[PDB]
Design a protein around this nucleic acid. Structure first.
Lengths: 75, 75
DNA sequence: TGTTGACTATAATCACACA
DNA sequence: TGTGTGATTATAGTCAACA
């Protein structure tokens, strides 16, 4: 009652910090909301595919890399 | 209207690789057929939680799903 | 209940990728 | 060689009104 979503909501936080960004920066660059971005990283939002596609663009990272990094992270 | 269409392609593919109807995936993943139908028509927004249920009823891990998804991304 | 109608998947087939 | 994805007709299937 947690997995995958927890793993997806972790890589986002990993990359964002490795990119030296902020939740206010991510919410702005992905046209989303800081309250929404916050809740995700702490696993309090359901998160959709389209709402994830916006994140990778806000984080400035291709879809391929995100999933490749996602695959590793679960291991 | 891209990533949701690329994930959906893999959904029916493994469904057609494992050899099962949408009604079978609807049952095995505990989801309404109209919803399973929906995401394949392209689409319904599709939450991550629902996506996790799909893989469970698809008898495949997430790593083999994303790997297959990525292979379907590179052209 | 019974059935019409439009929107679907489904299944059989072909043909050209690819390895 | 060999399997497999794409595209195709064509059948069967779904659902959502109606009286």
């Amino acid at each position: 009652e947690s997995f995958l979503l927890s793993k997806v909501s972790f890589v986002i936080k990993k990359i964002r910090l490795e990119k030296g960004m902020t939740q206010e920066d991510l919410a702005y660059k992905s046209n989303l909301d800081r309250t929404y971005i916050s809740g995700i990283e702490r696993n309090s939002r359901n998160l959709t595919i389209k709402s994830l596609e916006l994140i990778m663009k806000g984080l400035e990272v291709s879809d391929v890399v995100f999933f490749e990094m996602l695959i590793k992270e679960i291991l």
